[PDB]
Write an enzyme that holds these catalytic residues in place. Structure first.
Site, PDB file in Angstrom:
ATOM      1  CG  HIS A  57      -0.199   0.018   2.480  1.00 55.15           C
ATOM      2  ND1 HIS A  57       0.185  -1.126   3.135  1.00 55.15           N
ATOM      3  CD2 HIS A  57       0.327   1.048   3.213  1.00 55.15           C
ATOM      4  CE1 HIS A  57       0.887  -0.804   4.221  1.00 55.15           C
ATOM      5  NE2 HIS A  57       0.983   0.521   4.290  1.00 55.15           N
ATOM      6  CD  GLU A 110       3.165   6.094   7.336  1.00 55.06           C
ATOM      7  OE1 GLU A 110       3.396   4.881   7.439  1.00 55.06           O
ATOM      8  OE2 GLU A 110       2.208   6.624   7.920  1.00 55.06           O
ATOM      9  CG  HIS A 169       4.789   1.200   4.085  1.00 58.04           C
ATOM     10  ND1 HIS A 169       4.063   1.919   5.016  1.00 58.04           N
ATOM     11  CD2 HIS A 169       5.998   1.817   3.987  1.00 58.04           C
ATOM     12  CE1 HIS A 169       4.794   2.919   5.470  1.00 58.04           C
ATOM     13  NE2 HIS A 169       5.977   2.878   4.853  1.00 58.04           N
ATOM     14  CB  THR A 217       2.806   3.759  10.421  1.00 57.61           C
ATOM     15  OG1 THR A 217       2.235   3.408   9.149  1.00 57.61           O
ATOM     16  CG2 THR A 217       4.310   3.442  10.446  1.00 57.61           C
ATOM     17  CB  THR A 218      -2.558   2.317  10.432  1.00 53.86           C
ATOM     18  OG1 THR A 218      -2.380   0.921  10.104  1.00 53.86           O
ATOM     19  CG2 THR A 218      -2.098   3.149   9.241  1.00 53.86           C
TER      20      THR A 218
HETATM   21  C1  LIG Z   1      -2.846  -5.561   7.554  1.00 53.59           C
HETATM   22  C2  LIG Z   1      -1.865  -4.775   7.488  1.00 53.59           C
HETATM   23  O1  LIG Z   1      -0.751  -5.161   6.578  1.00 53.59           O
HETATM   24  N1  LIG Z   1      -1.698  -3.808   8.355  1.00 53.59           N
HETATM   25  C3  LIG Z   1      -0.926  -2.658   8.267  1.00 53.59           C
HETATM   26  N2  LIG Z   1      -1.076  -1.694   9.214  1.00 53.59           N
HETATM   27  N3  LIG Z   1      -0.014  -0.725   9.210  1.00 53.59           N
HETATM   28  C4  LIG Z   1       0.814  -1.102   8.248  1.00 53.59           C
HETATM   29  S1  LIG Z   1       2.240  -0.216   7.843  1.00 53.59           S
HETATM   30  N4  LIG Z   1       1.779   1.242   7.385  1.00 53.59           N
HETATM   31  O2  LIG Z   1       3.038  -0.089   9.056  1.00 53.59           O
HETATM   32  O3  LIG Z   1       2.863  -0.929   6.761  1.00 53.59           O
HETATM   33  S2  LIG Z   1       0.488  -2.636   7.539  1.00 53.59           S
HETATM   34 ZN   LIG Z   2       2.065   1.734   5.514  1.00 61.12          ZN
END
Ligand SMILES: CC(=O)Nc1nnc(S(N)(=O)=O)s1
Ligand SMILES: [Zn+2]
EC number: 4.2.1.1
Length: 257
Positions: free
Chosen positions: A91, A103, A116, A195-196
């Site tokens: 993503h 980020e 990522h 990071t989420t």
């Molecule tokens: C399901 C899933 O992959 N979760 C994520 N949540 N934060 C992410 S990150 N921005 O740290 O890559 S990935």
């Molecule tokens: Zn991410």
């Protein structure tokens, strides 16, 4: 619920997710003069030739491309990792303007976006188990800067119209993620977190030194996505990045001098 707006954004996350103020939160600023070169660090091994993409999803915070991770098809090994990590999705995070969006930052420099590639450690059997472990995930972070178009990204850019609003998905087969990598695989690495929300501290971060270039037109399409669902008031999907968190008790290591 959480988001990136004025009332539910990153500064608010800690009330529902107190680990937000934890000891190994991501992202962080990479200070290139205090990062430690570690010759003990192995080269990364990226083996994506057998990758199988399935679908692309607007998940309401970003968009993600999902892969078949029921077998060792596309894996990451080497670098600071032991064990093999399977690719499950990638993503992006991006900004409303070309001067922000990543980020991680490098010597406080922000990039226009950050890619990522998320991988989970097969020793734990499934993703949900991996995120409860300090070595459960490995995320490959790649910076995007605006310049010349990236041919390998265009197939992604072209389907965004189909998934404009939250919860829309489309078939997305035969996408080769190798078209998104830079030429060099030199990196920085540190122990960190998602990071989420839920911000679990289960991630070995691998951030590539060399950014990839995308065109203004390509990143513009990202900015036409919507946080909202269909039929709801339109809110453009921009600035879905978390700011840099304190490094605290951590050392960033570099694979290069
Ligand atoms: C399901 C899933 O992959 N979760 C994520 N949540 N934060 C992410 S990150 N921005 O740290 O890559 S990935
Ligand atoms: Zn991410």
């Amino acid at each position: 619920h959480w988001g990136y707006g004025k009332h539910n954004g990153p500064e608010h996350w800690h009330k529902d997710f107190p680990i937000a103020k934890g000891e190994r939160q991501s992202p962080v600023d990479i200070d290139t003069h205090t990062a430690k070169y570690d010759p003990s660090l192995k080269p990364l091994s990226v083996s994506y030739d057998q990758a199988t993409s399935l679908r692309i999803l607007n998940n309401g915070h970003s968009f993600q491309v999902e892969f078949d991770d029921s077998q060792d098809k596309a894996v990451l090994k080497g670098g600071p990792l032991d064990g093999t990590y399977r690719l499950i999705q990638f993503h992006f995070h991006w900004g409303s303007l070309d001067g922000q969006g990543s980020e991680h930052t490098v010597d406080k420099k922000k990039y226009a976006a950050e890619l990522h590639l998320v991988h989970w450690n097969t020793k734990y059997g499934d993703f949900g188990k991996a995120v409860q472990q300090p070595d459960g995930l490995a995320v490959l972070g790649i910076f995007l800067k605006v310049g010349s178009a990236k041919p390998g990204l265009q197939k992604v850019v072209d389907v965004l119209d189909s998934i404009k609003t939250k919860g829309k998905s489309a078939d997305f087969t035969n996408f080769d993620p190798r078209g998104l990598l830079p030429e060099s695989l030199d990196y920085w690495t540190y122990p960190g977190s998602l990071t989420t929300p839920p911000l679990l501290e289960c991630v070995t971060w691998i951030v590539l030194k060399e950014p990839i270039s995308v065109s203004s037109e390509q990143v513009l399409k990202f900015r036409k996505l919507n946080f909202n669902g269909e039929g709801e008031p339109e809110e453009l999907m921009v600035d879905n990045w978390r700011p840099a968190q304190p490094l605290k008790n951590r050392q960033i290591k570099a694979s290069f001098k």
